[PDB]
Design an enzyme around this catalytic site. Structure first.
Site, PDB file in Angstrom:
ATOM      1  N   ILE B 114       0.610  -1.036  -0.285  1.00 18.68           N
ATOM      2  CA  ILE B 114       0.008   0.029   0.176  1.00 18.68           C
ATOM      3  C   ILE B 114       0.799   0.993  -0.292  1.00 18.68           C
ATOM      4  O   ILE B 114       1.841   1.429   0.601  1.00 18.68           O
ATOM      5  CB  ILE B 114      -0.630   0.172   1.451  1.00 18.68           C
ATOM      6  CG1 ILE B 114      -1.973  -1.150   1.623  1.00 18.68           C
ATOM      7  CG2 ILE B 114      -1.834   1.121   1.441  1.00 18.68           C
ATOM      8  CD1 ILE B 114      -2.723  -1.398   0.726  1.00 18.68           C
ATOM      9  N   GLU B 115       0.625   2.216  -0.692  1.00 18.70           N
ATOM     10  CA  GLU B 115       1.828   3.075  -0.886  1.00 18.70           C
ATOM     11  C   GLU B 115       0.353   4.284  -0.955  1.00 18.70           C
ATOM     12  O   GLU B 115      -0.694   4.786  -1.630  1.00 18.70           O
ATOM     13  CB  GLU B 115       1.746   3.636  -2.926  1.00 18.70           C
ATOM     14  CG  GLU B 115       2.663   4.313  -2.983  1.00 18.70           C
ATOM     15  CD  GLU B 115       3.393   4.492  -4.093  1.00 18.70           C
ATOM     16  OE1 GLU B 115       2.921   3.537  -5.171  1.00 18.70           O
ATOM     17  OE2 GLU B 115       3.960   5.444  -4.883  1.00 18.70           O
ATOM     18  N   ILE B 116       1.150   5.224   0.457  1.00 19.44           N
ATOM     19  CA  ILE B 116       0.333   6.334   0.223  1.00 19.44           C
ATOM     20  C   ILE B 116       0.903   7.349  -0.051  1.00 19.44           C
ATOM     21  O   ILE B 116       1.468   8.426   0.085  1.00 19.44           O
ATOM     22  CB  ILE B 116      -0.275   6.255   1.848  1.00 19.44           C
ATOM     23  CG1 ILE B 116      -0.973   4.991   2.597  1.00 19.44           C
ATOM     24  CG2 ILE B 116      -1.248   7.500   2.361  1.00 19.44           C
ATOM     25  CD1 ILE B 116      -1.454   4.914   3.763  1.00 19.44           C
TER      26      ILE B 116
END
Lengths: 124, 119
Positions: B114-116
């Site tokens: 998960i890339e925020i």
């Protein structure tokens, strides 16, 4: 506060084959970023591509071709899309059928990309 | 003409564990619809959770996703650390769909990346 999805990464067996499918069928546009990486541009988002045996890090814990199940919204009348798909010689997995979209009801048609990913094309 | 992604399906080991992660960390909101179906909503999109038709190879931990936040990225880094979540990489400059973004990477319960990011 999360606003939207910006992009995602698909791990595929052959980038060339994947690009041809998304450009010719879905109308996406392929580009090269970071000097040698491939992506498919659409709307204000994109799909980055990783080819097996050369997947960039960090990546999913279990990179797997054909593991994606994605829904794309189209502004093209869904019945015209159905016709477009058949004319392209693409098999329709299911549809058109009513489904639940993020913000309401949608009419969906399902097809598969070269790696087996499920692609749901829908119109609100 | 394709306008945007509406939703996608994540195949997970345990829906409850997945919902808690996305609600408590990313601030998503879980909902139920139709046949006791579960989904996580945010903005004008959603993530459906499966514990037909479907992907040819439904696989937990096979997702690699990037979400845009309006929250100052450094505040996000702090929130993540305070939640006891390990930071895989970042904050680091990366290429977003429409320009440069600052990204922080973490993993969900199933190992999905998960890339925020903030523009």
């Amino acid at each position: 506060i999360i606003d939207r999805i910006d992009h995602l990464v698909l791990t595929v067996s052959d980038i060339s084959t994947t690009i041809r499918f998304y450009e010719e069928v879905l109308g996406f546009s392929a580009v090269t970023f970071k000097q040698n990486r491939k992506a498919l541009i659409f709307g204000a988002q994109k799909i980055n591509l990783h080819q097996q045996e050369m997947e960039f890090e960090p990546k999913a814990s279990r990179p797997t071709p054909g593991s994606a199940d994605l829904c794309f919204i189209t502004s093209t009348p869904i019945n015209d899309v159905v016709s477009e798909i058949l004319q392209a010689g693409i098999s329709i997995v299911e549809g058109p059928v009513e489904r639940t979209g993020a913000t309401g009801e949608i009419m969906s048609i399902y097809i598969r990309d070269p790696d087996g990913n499920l692609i749901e094309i829908s119109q609100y």
